[PDB]
Amino acid sequence: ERPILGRFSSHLKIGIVGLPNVGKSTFFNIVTKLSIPAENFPFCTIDPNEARVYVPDERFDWLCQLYKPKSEVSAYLEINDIALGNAFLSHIRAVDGIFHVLRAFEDKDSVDPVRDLETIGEELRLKDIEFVQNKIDDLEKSMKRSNDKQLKLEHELCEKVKAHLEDGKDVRFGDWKSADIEILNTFQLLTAKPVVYLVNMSEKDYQRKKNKFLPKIHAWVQEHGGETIIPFSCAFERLLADMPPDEAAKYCAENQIASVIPKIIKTGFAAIHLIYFFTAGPDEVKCWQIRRQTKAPQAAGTIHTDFERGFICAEVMKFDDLKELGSESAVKAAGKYRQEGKTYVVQDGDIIFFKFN
Numbered sequence: 256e257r258p259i260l261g262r263f264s265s266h267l268k269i270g271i272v273g274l275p276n277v278g279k280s281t282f283f284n285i286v287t288k289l290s291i292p293a294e295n296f297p298f299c300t301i302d303p304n305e306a307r308v309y310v311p312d313e314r315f316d317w318l319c320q321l322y323k324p325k326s327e328v329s330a331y332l333e334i335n336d337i338a339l340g341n342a343f344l345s346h347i348r349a350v351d352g353i354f355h356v357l358r359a360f361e362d363k364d365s366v367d368p369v370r371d372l373e374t375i376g377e378e379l380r381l382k383d384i385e386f387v388q389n390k391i392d393d394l395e396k397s398m399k400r401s402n403d404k405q406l407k408l409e410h411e412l413c414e415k416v417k418a419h420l421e422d423g424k425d426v427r428f429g430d431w432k433s434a435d436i437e438i439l440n441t442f443q444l445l446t447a448k449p450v451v452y453l454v455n456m457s458e459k460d461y462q463r464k465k466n467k468f469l470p471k472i473h474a475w476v477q478e479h480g481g482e483t484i485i486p487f488s489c490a491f492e493r494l495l496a497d498m499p500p501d502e503a504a505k506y507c508a509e510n511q512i513a514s515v516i517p518k519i520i521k522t523g524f525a526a527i528h529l530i531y532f533f534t535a536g537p538d539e540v541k542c543w544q545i546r547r548q549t550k551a552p553q554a555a556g557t558i559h560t561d562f563e564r565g566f567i568c569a570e571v572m573k574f575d576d577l578k579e580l581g582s583e584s585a586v587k588a589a590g591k592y593r594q595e596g597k598t599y600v601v602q603d604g605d606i607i608f609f610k611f612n
């Protein structure tokens with residue numbers, strides 16, 4: 256319903272945030288080892304702390320089996336290893352979502368995730384108050400010399416925002432009007448950025464699917480957003496990425512265990528409000544990355560500007576209808592090759608051909 260809280264930008268990043276020595280770089284290096292080579296994004300500089308990972312998708316893979324196309328193109332998630340400090344917030348402001356890593360395994364100076372959640376939670380809210388407060392000063396200083404309604408509106412929000420933060424809540428979970436969000440998105444505020452909780456634990460805990468700290472983390476999250484908790488073992492994953500495909504498959508069978516990195520990649524990608532639509536022929540099958548609540552013309556623009564400027568229609572078929580009926584010819588036969596106009600919001604998984612001029 257409401258507009259999305261986050262920057263109206265193409266190149267979205269997710270940051271690895273957490274207390275020191277909980278698994279941040281060990282998780283990043285697993286991610287890095289699975290990354291796309293930086294030379295394949297020639298328009299971008301990929302710093303050593305940055306990596307981009309293919310978003311795995313079973314629907315995408317099925318479309319590659321069907322068309323057996325010449326070019327298979329995936330979407331990607333950009334993950335940023337950050338660092339806790341002050342210059343910590345430079346790297347943290349430049350991302351659009353947080354992999355909040357939390358330590359849930361015993362050492363071999365204390366072990367507690369919910370305490371670490373509070374430390375970072377509080378530390379995040381405080382530096383947002385610091386941000387809001389300064390613009391609160393700058394606004395009312397300028398309102399002395401101007402009668403601008405926008406200065407008043409921005410001032411009213413900044414007061415309501417600081418109330419929310421002092422009340423012990425994150426800007427992300429406020430009940431904001433559409434126009435408040437517009438102003439909020441200018442501020443790039445830390446607690447406006449979405450979180451995916453990654454509970455790092457032993458390989459034993461992970462495989463057993465039980466952990467002493469998990470119910471205490473889980474119940475806390477329900478009281479603070481209800482965001483996704485993915486339990487994972489950083490050691491197991493490190494171990495598993497270091498071994499080749501069939502050794503991994505033998506290991507996964509014999510230990511009755513499986514990697515959750517794909518789920519982590521998928522969940523992070525969705526959590527920062529990205530989706531994609533497919534295009535699919537023998538030429539290529541490609542995932543077309545877009546923000547949620549994107550209308551069909553703006554989606555078409557992402558391929559070629561003309562597709563938007565002279566937009567006629569988007570010829571869209573759902574994935575479920577293609578896998579069921581076996582081919583596009585067959586989907587057409589059943590009158591399921593729909594035709595959508597300029598106010599059609601694109602669904603994740605839509606397979607689209609655009610008509611224009």
Ligand SMILES: Nc1ncnc2c1ncn2[C@@H]1O[C@H](COP(=O)(O)OP(=O)(O)NP(=O)(O)O)[C@@H](O)[C@H]1O
Binds near residue numbers: 457488
């Ligand atoms: N599930 C686990 N079991 C055992 N050891 C682990 C597990 N997860 C992480 N570790 C170890 O704990 C350490 C965590 O450090 P690391 O992953 O480098 O975080 P970091 O990047 O140092 N965070 P920061 O200090 O903010 O830079 C590593 O040396 C890991 O080997």
Ligand SMILES: [Cl-]
Binds near residue numbers: 337338346
């Ligand atoms: Cl850094």
Ligand SMILES: [Cl-]
Binds near residue numbers: 338
């Ligand atoms: Cl440092």
Ligand SMILES: [Cl-]
Binds near residue numbers: 534558609
């Ligand atoms: Cl097209």
Ligand SMILES: [Mg+2]
Binds near residue numbers: 279280
């Ligand atoms: Mg690190």
